[PDB]
Tab-separated table of C-alpha atoms in Angstrom:
chain	number	residue	atom	x	y	z
A	535	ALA	CA	0.126	0.086	0.126
A	536	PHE	CA	1.487	3.189	-0.986
A	537	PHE	CA	0.244	6.848	0.055
A	538	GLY	CA	1.901	9.704	-1.899
A	539	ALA	CA	2.433	13.045	-0.453
A	540	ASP	CA	-0.034	14.972	-2.505
A	541	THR	CA	-3.286	12.607	-2.280
A	542	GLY	CA	-3.404	11.996	1.422
A	543	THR	CA	-1.645	11.887	4.447
A	544	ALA	CA	0.437	8.625	5.042
A	545	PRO	CA	-1.381	6.413	8.109
A	546	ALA	CA	0.439	6.862	11.445
A	547	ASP	CA	-0.088	3.438	12.476
A	548	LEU	CA	0.626	-0.069	11.209
A	549	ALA	CA	-3.049	-1.425	11.336
A	550	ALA	CA	-4.056	1.521	8.954
A	551	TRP	CA	-1.542	0.256	6.245
A	552	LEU	CA	-2.503	-3.321	6.874
A	553	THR	CA	-6.113	-2.204	6.196
A	554	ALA	CA	-5.037	-0.458	2.935
A	555	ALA	CA	-3.015	-3.550	1.847
A	556	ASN	CA	-5.930	-5.877	2.342
A	557	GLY	CA	-8.263	-3.551	0.255
A	558	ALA	CA	-7.884	-2.175	-3.103
A	559	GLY	CA	-5.506	0.772	-2.652
A	560	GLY	CA	-2.753	-1.988	-1.782
A	561	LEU	CA	-2.210	-4.174	-4.636
A	562	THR	CA	-1.149	-7.679	-4.565
A	563	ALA	CA	1.872	-9.566	-6.014
A	564	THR	CA	3.113	-13.023	-6.483
A	565	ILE	CA	6.472	-14.392	-5.763
A	566	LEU	CA	7.938	-17.386	-7.953
A	567	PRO	CA	9.233	-20.076	-5.645
A	568	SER	CA	12.660	-21.516	-5.908
A	569	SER	CA	13.661	-18.118	-7.402
A	570	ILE	CA	15.072	-14.875	-6.326
A	571	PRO	CA	11.943	-12.722	-7.209
A	572	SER	CA	12.259	-9.258	-8.672
A	573	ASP	CA	8.742	-8.109	-7.773
A	574	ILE	CA	7.485	-4.891	-9.788
A	575	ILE	CA	4.687	-3.123	-8.556
A	576	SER	CA	2.653	0.114	-10.041
A	577	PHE	CA	0.705	2.490	-8.333
A	578	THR	CA	-1.226	5.493	-9.845
A	579	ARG	CA	-0.547	9.036	-8.645
A	580	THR	CA	-1.623	12.342	-9.739
A	581	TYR	CA	-0.233	15.270	-8.504
A	582	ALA	CA	-2.674	18.654	-8.969
A	583	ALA	CA	0.214	20.812	-8.551
A	584	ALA	CA	3.548	19.992	-9.121
A	585	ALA	CA	5.833	19.580	-6.281
A	586	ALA	CA	9.450	20.331	-6.200
A	587	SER	CA	10.475	17.421	-3.831
A	588	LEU	CA	8.381	14.159	-3.701
A	589	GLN	CA	8.295	12.174	-0.781
A	590	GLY	CA	6.383	8.904	-1.149
A	591	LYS	CA	5.678	6.351	1.521
A	592	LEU	CA	4.972	2.395	0.866
A	593	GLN	CA	4.544	-0.095	3.144
A	594	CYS	CA	3.952	-4.040	2.463
A	595	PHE	CA	2.916	-7.125	4.033
A	596	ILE	CA	3.705	-10.488	3.464
A	597	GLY	CA	0.847	-12.220	5.453
A	598	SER	CA	0.336	-10.155	8.522
A	599	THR	CA	3.752	-9.234	9.249
A	600	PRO	CA	5.169	-6.056	7.328
A	601	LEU	CA	8.212	-6.134	5.234
A	602	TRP	CA	9.558	-2.896	6.413
A	603	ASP	CA	10.101	-2.709	10.149
A	604	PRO	CA	8.299	0.258	11.647
A	605	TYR	CA	11.003	1.115	13.814
A	606	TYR	CA	13.514	1.650	10.873
A	607	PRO	CA	12.008	4.806	8.920
A	608	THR	CA	9.789	4.018	5.941
A	609	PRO	CA	10.901	4.104	2.368
A	610	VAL	CA	10.934	7.876	1.344
A	611	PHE	CA	12.159	8.868	-2.246
A	612	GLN	CA	12.766	12.259	-3.773
A	613	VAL	CA	12.015	11.881	-7.123
A	614	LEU	CA	13.010	15.187	-9.207
A	615	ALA	CA	10.598	17.660	-10.700
A	616	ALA	CA	10.084	20.637	-13.095
A	617	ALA	CA	10.285	18.436	-16.136
A	618	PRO	CA	13.682	19.852	-17.479
A	619	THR	CA	14.310	20.163	-21.344
A	620	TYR	CA	17.603	18.470	-22.686
A	621	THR	CA	19.824	20.460	-24.921
A	622	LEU	CA	22.012	18.155	-26.787
A	623	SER	CA	24.965	18.850	-28.992
A	624	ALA	CA	27.289	17.084	-31.246
A	625	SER	CA	30.957	16.740	-32.042
A	626	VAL	CA	32.423	14.164	-34.652
A	627	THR	CA	35.776	12.977	-35.598
A	628	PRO	CA	36.591	13.002	-38.534
A	629	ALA	CA	34.021	14.513	-41.196
A	630	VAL	CA	34.260	12.336	-43.991
A	631	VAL	CA	34.197	8.344	-43.478
A	632	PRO	CA	35.672	5.710	-45.504
A	633	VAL	CA	33.793	2.364	-45.952
A	634	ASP	CA	33.892	0.371	-42.614
A	635	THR	CA	35.859	2.930	-40.642
A	636	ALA	CA	35.213	4.011	-37.213
A	637	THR	CA	33.973	7.389	-36.453
A	638	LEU	CA	34.009	9.007	-33.250
A	639	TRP	CA	30.786	10.901	-31.977
A	640	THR	CA	30.514	12.614	-28.651
A	641	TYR	CA	27.027	14.271	-27.549
A	642	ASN	CA	27.103	16.456	-24.275
A	643	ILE	CA	23.735	15.788	-22.651
A	644	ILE	CA	22.600	19.301	-20.662
A	645	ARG	CA	19.827	19.489	-18.139
A	646	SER	CA	18.231	23.046	-17.873
A	647	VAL	CA	16.873	22.416	-14.244
A	648	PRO	CA	19.328	21.120	-11.891
A	649	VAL	CA	18.785	17.536	-10.387
A	650	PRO	CA	17.613	18.233	-6.874
A	651	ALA	CA	19.757	17.129	-3.936
A	652	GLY	CA	19.121	13.606	-2.304
A	653	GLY	CA	17.478	12.071	-5.430
A	654	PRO	CA	18.219	9.078	-7.644
A	655	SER	CA	20.235	9.465	-10.659
A	656	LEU	CA	18.415	9.869	-14.083
A	657	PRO	CA	19.500	6.898	-16.181
A	658	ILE	CA	19.319	7.974	-19.925
A	659	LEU	CA	19.640	5.274	-22.648
A	660	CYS	CA	20.814	6.855	-26.020
A	661	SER	CA	20.133	5.264	-28.844
A	662	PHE	CA	22.394	5.163	-31.953
A	663	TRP	CA	21.085	4.222	-35.631
A	664	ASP	CA	24.479	3.577	-37.331
A	665	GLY	CA	22.273	3.339	-40.870
A	666	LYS	CA	23.181	-0.223	-41.941
A	667	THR	CA	19.622	-1.199	-42.397
A	668	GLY	CA	18.196	1.870	-44.014
A	669	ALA	CA	15.447	3.028	-42.118
A	670	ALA	CA	16.017	5.105	-38.618
A	671	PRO	CA	13.240	4.688	-36.323
A	672	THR	CA	10.788	7.643	-36.159
A	673	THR	CA	8.507	6.894	-33.122
A	674	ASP	CA	9.504	6.374	-29.623
A	675	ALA	CA	8.618	2.672	-29.742
A	676	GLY	CA	11.111	2.052	-32.253
A	677	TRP	CA	13.638	4.000	-30.308
A	678	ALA	CA	13.211	2.689	-27.074
A	679	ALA	CA	13.584	-0.572	-28.273
A	680	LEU	CA	16.906	0.150	-29.846
A	681	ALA	CA	17.929	1.574	-26.701
A	682	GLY	CA	17.633	-1.686	-24.609
A	683	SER	CA	19.824	-3.515	-27.215
A	684	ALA	CA	23.737	-3.321	-27.492
A	685	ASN	CA	22.839	-0.441	-30.134
A	686	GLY	CA	22.419	1.986	-27.398
A	687	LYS	CA	24.254	2.919	-24.470
A	688	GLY	CA	23.336	4.167	-20.791
A	689	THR	CA	24.632	6.945	-18.943
A	690	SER	CA	23.710	8.414	-15.433
A	691	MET	CA	22.799	11.925	-14.565
A	692	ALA	CA	24.653	12.475	-11.067
A	693	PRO	CA	22.394	14.314	-8.620
A	694	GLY	CA	22.840	17.936	-9.029
A	695	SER	CA	24.875	17.728	-12.088
A	696	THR	CA	23.442	18.830	-15.314
A	697	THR	CA	26.241	17.697	-18.004
A	698	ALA	CA	26.593	14.451	-18.990
A	699	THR	CA	28.722	12.736	-21.864
A	700	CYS	CA	27.820	9.945	-23.928
A	701	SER	CA	30.230	8.463	-26.662
A	702	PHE	CA	29.787	5.683	-29.384
A	703	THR	CA	31.276	4.144	-32.456
A	704	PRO	CA	29.159	3.341	-35.366
A	705	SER	CA	29.821	0.878	-38.025
A	706	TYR	CA	28.648	1.262	-41.503
A	707	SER	CA	28.375	-0.992	-44.552
A	708	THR	CA	28.945	1.520	-47.354
A	709	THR	CA	30.104	4.977	-47.239
A	710	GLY	CA	26.897	7.140	-47.889
A	711	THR	CA	25.705	10.485	-47.266
A	712	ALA	CA	24.296	9.456	-43.670
A	713	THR	CA	24.903	9.812	-40.252
A	714	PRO	CA	23.907	7.783	-37.273
A	715	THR	CA	20.725	9.151	-35.831
A	716	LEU	CA	20.057	9.849	-32.089
A	717	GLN	CA	17.336	9.382	-29.658
A	718	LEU	CA	17.427	10.553	-26.188
A	719	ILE	CA	15.043	8.044	-23.895
A	720	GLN	CA	14.733	7.251	-20.439
A	721	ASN	CA	12.849	4.059	-19.705
A	722	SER	CA	11.271	2.150	-16.540
A	723	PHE	CA	11.860	-1.716	-15.839
A	724	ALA	CA	10.968	-4.202	-18.330
A	725	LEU	CA	10.363	-1.468	-21.115
A	726	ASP	CA	6.510	-0.679	-20.311
A	727	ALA	CA	5.865	2.758	-22.077
A	728	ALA	CA	7.564	4.905	-24.405
A	729	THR	CA	8.331	8.654	-23.676
A	730	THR	CA	10.945	11.000	-25.685
A	731	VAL	CA	12.158	14.582	-24.847
A	732	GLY	CA	14.726	15.667	-27.611
A	733	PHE	CA	14.999	14.584	-31.153
A	734	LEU	CA	18.032	15.148	-33.238
A	735	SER	CA	19.150	15.546	-36.992
A	736	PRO	CA	21.791	14.384	-38.766
A	737	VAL	CA	25.453	15.672	-38.414
A	738	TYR	CA	27.787	15.086	-41.511
A	749	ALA	CA	38.531	2.535	-49.039
A	750	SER	CA	42.277	2.394	-49.826
A	751	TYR	CA	43.888	-0.509	-51.399
A	752	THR	CA	47.338	-1.551	-51.858
A	753	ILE	CA	48.821	-4.192	-54.071
A	754	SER	CA	52.291	-6.109	-54.201
A	755	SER	CA	52.670	-8.321	-57.284
A	756	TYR	CA	55.440	-10.994	-57.414
A	757	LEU	CA	56.351	-13.461	-60.227
A	758	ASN	CA	57.596	-17.179	-59.781
A	759	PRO	CA	59.753	-17.983	-61.359
A	760	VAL	CA	61.385	-14.686	-62.270
A	761	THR	CA	63.376	-15.974	-64.922
A	762	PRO	CA	61.630	-16.182	-68.510
A	763	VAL	CA	62.806	-19.613	-69.257
A	764	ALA	CA	62.337	-20.060	-73.447
A	765	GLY	CA	60.746	-23.419	-73.706
A	766	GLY	CA	60.015	-23.990	-70.090
A	767	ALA	CA	57.360	-23.792	-67.376
A	768	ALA	CA	54.973	-20.977	-67.667
A	769	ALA	CA	55.550	-18.187	-64.867
A	770	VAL	CA	52.864	-17.553	-62.366
A	771	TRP	CA	52.376	-14.108	-61.231
A	772	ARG	CA	50.693	-13.736	-57.926
A	773	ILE	CA	48.954	-10.213	-57.214
A	774	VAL	CA	48.406	-9.490	-53.336
A	775	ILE	CA	45.626	-6.977	-52.802
A	776	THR	CA	45.302	-5.536	-49.112
A	777	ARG	CA	42.528	-3.338	-47.920
A	778	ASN	CA	42.959	-1.043	-45.063
A	779	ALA	CA	39.699	-1.845	-43.595
A	780	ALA	CA	38.552	-5.734	-43.026
A	781	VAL	CA	35.771	-7.418	-44.990
A	782	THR	CA	33.014	-7.072	-42.346
A	783	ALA	CA	29.783	-7.921	-44.156
A	784	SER	CA	30.101	-10.518	-47.099
A	785	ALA	CA	32.589	-12.098	-49.090
A	786	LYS	CA	33.957	-9.976	-51.904
A	787	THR	CA	34.610	-10.669	-55.385
A	788	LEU	CA	37.713	-8.607	-57.009
A	789	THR	CA	38.444	-8.469	-60.676
A	790	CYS	CA	41.978	-8.565	-61.161
A	791	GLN	CA	42.753	-7.123	-64.656
A	792	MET	CA	46.445	-7.580	-66.030
A	793	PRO	CA	46.833	-5.282	-69.079
A	794	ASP	CA	48.982	-7.075	-71.848
A	795	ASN	CA	52.599	-6.620	-71.491
A	796	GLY	CA	53.384	-7.300	-75.105
A	797	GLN	CA	54.054	-11.187	-74.409
A	798	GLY	CA	51.224	-13.733	-75.214
A	799	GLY	CA	48.515	-11.405	-75.105
A	800	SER	CA	46.584	-10.048	-72.240
A	801	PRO	CA	46.004	-12.926	-69.683
A	802	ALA	CA	42.426	-13.617	-68.833
A	803	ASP	CA	40.942	-11.513	-66.010
A	804	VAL	CA	40.702	-13.135	-62.834
A	805	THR	CA	37.798	-13.018	-60.277
A	806	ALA	CA	39.083	-14.076	-56.852
A	807	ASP	CA	36.678	-14.376	-54.049
A	808	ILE	CA	37.851	-13.291	-50.667
A	809	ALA	CA	36.705	-15.084	-47.522
A	810	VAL	CA	34.747	-13.110	-45.029
A	811	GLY	CA	36.942	-11.328	-42.739
A	812	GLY	CA	39.686	-11.146	-45.238
A	813	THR	CA	41.465	-8.012	-46.156
A	814	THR	CA	43.969	-9.884	-48.460
A	815	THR	CA	43.384	-11.198	-51.744
A	816	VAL	CA	45.633	-13.335	-54.106
A	817	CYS	CA	45.120	-13.329	-57.836
A	818	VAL	CA	46.905	-15.940	-59.860
A	819	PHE	CA	47.955	-15.221	-63.610
A	820	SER	CA	49.771	-17.272	-66.089
A	821	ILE	CA	51.559	-16.164	-69.274
A	822	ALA	CA	52.477	-18.853	-71.983
A	823	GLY	CA	54.610	-16.700	-74.145
A	824	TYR	CA	56.223	-14.939	-71.243
A	825	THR	CA	59.082	-17.030	-72.054
A	826	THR	CA	59.827	-14.866	-74.923
A	827	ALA	CA	59.479	-11.620	-73.047
A	828	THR	CA	61.447	-8.446	-73.891
A	829	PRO	CA	63.249	-7.029	-70.564
A	830	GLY	CA	61.661	-3.650	-69.809
A	831	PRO	CA	59.094	-1.663	-67.392
A	832	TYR	CA	55.475	-2.539	-67.642
A	833	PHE	CA	52.554	-1.423	-65.903
A	834	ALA	CA	49.591	-3.218	-64.467
A	835	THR	CA	46.105	-1.864	-63.106
A	836	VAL	CA	43.577	-3.547	-61.328
A	837	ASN	CA	40.034	-2.299	-60.629
A	838	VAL	CA	38.861	-3.128	-57.175
A	839	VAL	CA	35.125	-3.098	-56.506
A	840	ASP	CA	33.609	-3.169	-52.936
A	841	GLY	CA	30.212	-1.786	-51.990
A	842	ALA	CA	29.439	1.705	-52.910
A	843	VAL	CA	33.172	2.664	-53.523
A	844	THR	CA	33.206	1.176	-57.059
A	845	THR	CA	36.148	0.991	-59.732
A	846	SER	CA	39.357	1.734	-57.553
A	847	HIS	CA	42.327	1.751	-59.840
A	848	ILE	CA	45.530	0.333	-58.696
A	849	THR	CA	48.647	0.795	-60.851
A	850	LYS	CA	51.787	-1.170	-60.292
A	851	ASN	CA	55.242	-1.112	-61.897
A	852	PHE	CA	57.250	-4.363	-62.619
A	853	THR	CA	60.541	-4.661	-64.755
A	854	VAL	CA	60.415	-7.972	-66.498
A	855	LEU	CA	64.044	-9.248	-67.498
A	856	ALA	CA	64.755	-11.847	-70.292
A	857	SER	CA	66.835	-14.900	-69.170
A	858	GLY	CA	66.325	-16.724	-72.330
A	859	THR	CA	66.904	-20.489	-72.407
A	860	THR	CA	69.148	-20.961	-69.286
A	861	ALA	CA	67.526	-22.417	-66.321
A	862	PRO	CA	68.729	-20.905	-63.198
A	863	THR	CA	69.515	-22.879	-59.754
A	864	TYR	CA	69.329	-21.740	-56.054
A	865	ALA	CA	72.423	-23.149	-54.031
A	866	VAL	CA	71.704	-23.742	-50.108
A	867	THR	CA	74.502	-24.198	-47.692
A	868	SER	CA	73.849	-25.058	-43.876
A	869	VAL	CA	76.066	-24.144	-40.892
A	870	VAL	CA	75.412	-24.253	-37.011
A	871	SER	CA	77.327	-22.012	-34.476
A	872	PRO	CA	77.443	-23.764	-31.341
A	873	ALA	CA	78.053	-27.096	-33.010
A	874	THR	CA	78.569	-30.516	-31.815
A	875	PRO	CA	77.967	-31.452	-28.817
A	876	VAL	CA	74.802	-29.513	-27.963
A	877	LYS	CA	73.331	-30.202	-24.603
A	878	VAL	CA	69.424	-30.708	-24.279
A	879	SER	CA	67.329	-27.794	-24.112
A	880	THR	CA	69.858	-25.162	-25.189
A	881	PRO	CA	69.760	-22.633	-27.816
A	882	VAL	CA	71.236	-23.777	-31.286
A	883	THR	CA	71.961	-21.517	-34.269
A	884	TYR	CA	71.143	-22.572	-37.705
A	885	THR	CA	72.255	-20.155	-40.382
A	886	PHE	CA	71.062	-21.235	-43.993
A	887	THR	CA	72.622	-19.324	-47.019
A	888	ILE	CA	70.383	-19.210	-50.126
A	889	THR	CA	72.686	-18.107	-53.014
A	890	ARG	CA	72.120	-17.765	-56.892
A	891	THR	CA	75.095	-18.163	-58.860
A	892	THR	CA	73.625	-16.679	-61.617
A	893	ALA	CA	72.166	-13.869	-59.831
A	894	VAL	CA	69.810	-12.643	-62.652
A	895	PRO	CA	67.700	-9.873	-61.045
A	896	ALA	CA	69.311	-6.545	-62.245
A	897	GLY	CA	66.659	-4.025	-61.535
A	898	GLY	CA	63.408	-5.512	-61.831
A	899	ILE	CA	61.247	-7.932	-59.257
A	900	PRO	CA	62.784	-8.966	-56.052
A	901	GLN	CA	61.875	-12.389	-55.237
A	902	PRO	CA	61.429	-12.846	-51.293
A	903	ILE	CA	62.057	-16.251	-49.970
A	904	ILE	CA	60.091	-17.757	-47.220
A	905	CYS	CA	62.221	-20.459	-45.438
A	906	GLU	CA	60.766	-23.432	-43.541
A	907	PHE	CA	63.044	-24.522	-40.956
A	908	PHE	CA	62.761	-28.077	-39.787
A	909	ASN	CA	64.872	-30.031	-37.119
A	910	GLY	CA	65.184	-33.665	-36.990
A	911	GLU	CA	62.394	-34.229	-34.438
A	912	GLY	CA	60.324	-37.067	-36.334
A	913	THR	CA	57.091	-35.623	-37.659
A	914	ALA	CA	58.761	-34.991	-41.148
A	931	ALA	CA	58.325	-24.632	-37.844
A	932	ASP	CA	59.474	-21.252	-36.964
A	933	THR	CA	58.553	-19.869	-40.502
A	934	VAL	CA	60.498	-16.770	-41.533
A	935	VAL	CA	60.683	-14.663	-44.823
A	936	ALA	CA	63.623	-12.840	-46.272
A	937	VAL	CA	63.550	-10.445	-49.173
A	938	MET	CA	66.206	-11.266	-51.759
A	939	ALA	CA	67.837	-8.169	-52.769
A	940	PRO	CA	68.262	-8.329	-56.648
A	941	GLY	CA	72.021	-7.189	-56.337
A	942	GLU	CA	73.145	-9.158	-53.306
A	943	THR	CA	72.434	-12.858	-54.120
A	944	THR	CA	73.177	-13.770	-50.619
A	945	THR	CA	70.253	-14.543	-48.194
A	946	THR	CA	70.579	-15.557	-44.755
A	947	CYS	CA	68.090	-17.618	-43.021
A	948	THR	CA	68.728	-17.540	-39.286
A	949	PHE	CA	67.080	-20.096	-37.072
A	950	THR	CA	67.070	-21.599	-33.331
A	951	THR	CA	65.650	-25.080	-32.527
A	952	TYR	CA	66.004	-25.867	-28.599
A	953	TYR	CA	66.104	-29.886	-29.204
A	954	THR	CA	64.142	-31.275	-26.365
A	955	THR	CA	65.175	-34.922	-26.867
A	956	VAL	CA	68.172	-37.147	-26.340
A	957	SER	CA	70.549	-37.480	-29.360
A	958	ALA	CA	69.903	-41.191	-30.487
A	959	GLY	CA	73.013	-40.949	-32.594
A	960	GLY	CA	72.179	-37.596	-34.369
A	961	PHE	CA	69.479	-35.265	-35.890
A	962	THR	CA	69.417	-34.013	-39.551
A	963	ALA	CA	67.711	-30.460	-40.343
A	964	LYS	CA	65.756	-30.134	-43.350
A	965	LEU	CA	65.448	-26.525	-44.525
A	966	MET	CA	62.435	-25.730	-47.268
A	967	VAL	CA	62.411	-22.676	-49.233
A	968	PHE	CA	59.227	-21.082	-51.166
A	969	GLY	CA	59.295	-18.291	-53.714
A	970	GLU	CA	55.974	-16.986	-52.656
B	583	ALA	CA	27.377	16.259	-78.163
B	584	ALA	CA	29.277	16.794	-74.503
B	585	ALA	CA	33.436	16.971	-75.424
B	586	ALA	CA	36.001	16.021	-73.151
B	587	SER	CA	38.519	18.664	-74.578
B	588	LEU	CA	37.394	22.226	-75.500
B	589	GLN	CA	39.627	24.538	-77.370
B	590	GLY	CA	37.925	28.070	-78.126
B	591	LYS	CA	39.547	30.466	-80.212
B	592	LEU	CA	38.784	34.447	-79.994
B	593	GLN	CA	40.100	37.047	-82.444
B	594	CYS	CA	39.555	40.896	-81.796
B	595	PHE	CA	40.262	43.927	-84.128
B	596	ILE	CA	40.548	47.427	-82.941
B	597	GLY	CA	39.927	48.871	-86.433
B	598	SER	CA	41.740	46.622	-88.822
B	599	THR	CA	44.514	45.385	-86.975
B	600	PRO	CA	44.180	42.340	-84.920
B	601	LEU	CA	45.304	42.356	-81.177
B	602	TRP	CA	46.540	38.820	-81.225
B	603	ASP	CA	49.810	38.447	-83.196
B	604	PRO	CA	49.590	35.450	-86.029
B	605	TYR	CA	52.680	34.451	-85.309
B	606	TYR	CA	52.192	33.290	-81.764
B	607	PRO	CA	49.384	30.924	-81.640
B	608	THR	CA	45.705	31.953	-80.664
B	609	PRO	CA	44.645	31.609	-77.267
B	610	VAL	CA	43.131	28.231	-76.164
B	611	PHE	CA	41.236	27.529	-72.993
B	612	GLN	CA	40.813	23.863	-71.699
B	613	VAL	CA	37.031	24.222	-70.309
B	614	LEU	CA	36.701	20.676	-68.430
B	615	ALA	CA	34.160	18.257	-69.068
B	616	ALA	CA	31.838	15.519	-67.726
B	617	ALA	CA	29.949	17.808	-65.016
B	618	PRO	CA	31.182	16.506	-61.719
B	619	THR	CA	29.043	16.840	-58.611
B	620	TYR	CA	30.785	17.897	-55.451
B	621	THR	CA	30.128	16.024	-52.175
B	622	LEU	CA	30.682	18.337	-49.172
B	623	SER	CA	31.361	17.627	-45.691
B	624	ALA	CA	31.566	19.274	-42.325
B	625	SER	CA	33.754	19.168	-39.175
B	626	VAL	CA	32.848	21.683	-36.111
B	627	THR	CA	35.006	22.552	-33.109
B	628	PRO	CA	33.217	22.679	-30.458
B	629	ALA	CA	29.827	21.059	-30.220
B	630	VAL	CA	28.047	23.513	-27.625
B	631	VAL	CA	27.714	27.062	-28.769
C	728	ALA	CA	23.347	32.121	-60.266
C	729	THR	CA	24.303	28.629	-60.595
C	730	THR	CA	24.326	26.006	-57.877
C	731	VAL	CA	25.676	22.415	-57.592
C	732	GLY	CA	25.360	20.870	-54.190
C	733	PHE	CA	23.014	21.549	-51.366
C	734	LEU	CA	23.587	20.812	-47.663
C	735	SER	CA	21.665	20.717	-44.158
C	736	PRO	CA	22.374	22.227	-41.002
C	737	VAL	CA	25.209	20.797	-38.824
C	738	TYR	CA	24.831	21.053	-35.335
C	749	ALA	CA	27.944	33.636	-21.164
C	750	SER	CA	30.120	33.371	-18.095
C	751	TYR	CA	30.602	36.138	-15.874
C	752	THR	CA	32.826	36.724	-12.997
C	753	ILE	CA	32.368	39.273	-10.217
C	754	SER	CA	34.916	40.862	-7.643
C	755	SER	CA	33.554	43.364	-4.935
C	756	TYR	CA	35.315	45.740	-2.712
C	757	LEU	CA	34.526	48.370	-0.085
C	758	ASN	CA	36.033	51.675	0.507
C	759	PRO	CA	36.766	52.537	3.155
C	760	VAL	CA	37.173	48.999	4.572
C	761	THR	CA	36.274	49.891	8.124
C	762	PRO	CA	32.737	51.022	8.818
C	763	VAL	CA	32.928	54.128	11.031
C	764	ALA	CA	29.997	55.022	13.122
C	765	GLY	CA	29.446	58.525	12.834
C	766	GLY	CA	31.141	59.131	9.299
C	767	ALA	CA	30.676	58.859	5.524
C	768	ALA	CA	28.523	56.107	4.049
C	769	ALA	CA	30.861	53.301	2.960
C	770	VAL	CA	31.167	53.067	-0.941
C	771	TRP	CA	30.788	49.411	-2.349
C	772	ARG	CA	32.183	48.830	-5.803
C	773	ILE	CA	31.381	45.625	-7.738
C	774	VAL	CA	33.055	44.806	-11.094
C	775	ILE	CA	31.623	42.200	-13.438
C	776	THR	CA	33.746	40.910	-16.169
């Protein structure tokens, strides 16, 4: 049974509270057994004249016994007043946004009428509509249902404090001329009704490629070279699997290679396009261009130009020599560092001023499975490439172990 | 038809003598094409006024 | 007159010091003049 300060004086004795609770003025509520109950009770009070400080009094009875001991004071709540208007503002960084990029928004909530002292904080649930769906909520029910979810965030107005900050970070599918819509809603428990105060209006990718060719040397009357194109994006592929159209413009050897359409798995910024030229065996040494058109979302037809100087080896087949040595050497103790240096040389040393062929060397010690994978760019001039490794053998000798280095041009 | 490269030619005469000498070429103006649309944006500091 | 692109809207303090001349109120004397500056 509840008695507001405006409707009528709270009964002095417990018997009158019990009578009110037994009657209609006091409402009944049911508690679920075998569970901690969160009992929500809703009264009805109408203040003819607005009061600056509220003092409500509620007394409850489980059976005859009251919940609130009369010796300790009854619950009294000062629940604000004067119905202030919230003057919001917008700060943003940066102005323009690329595709799938994070944008910083900060909105300072201002309250005209100060929060009276000795009152509960004011929980505001700011709603943010990033704009991916397409339709921003207009009514209070489409906005209050968004505040509850992760799309909207919460903030507490301190007693006596007017300023309130609320930062958020929205995501977008494509770069459009749209900004995240705001709504300023406070709600009761279990989202029963809808009430709004202040509305607000709008406030208004790069691609790299690193192409490498394997083998580098045109072998006239040999296996066709495989050109591999690596396209990285600054922003991660969020929504759906993309399809980029790699296009290799003719280098004057064996015609223009057929355009490739490589599908990238979701959450993959990098993509690999594979071209194969048959007449590259007879390629003239010189600098050639290669432009690729990337399509992703609304930002369409992004042109990426890359340069590459194809040399002409001819009919000679180059070879890669590999030498190994160990600094600590025999005899190594179990569980101690052992340094393996591998020299991967090329006696012919053909790359003059064109495509460098980085080599990924996968070390493997004599463990038994038959790996500290490291990469080393081959400098076109200096043919010597050093792969350092450390193994940390964790087993007995059993006579002796044998390392097995593997090299890859990719 | 909309052209990509415009080259307009103007020649003036005060009486009989022309202003622009024939030895040096006549003035040429490159007058753009394709009618692009300008997409504007805004950044503000600070929020409250 | 020609236009290409259109756009939509994109959304003091006072301190006081006060002194008194003379500082000491003299009973039987000139009324004390209080000055207040508001910058």
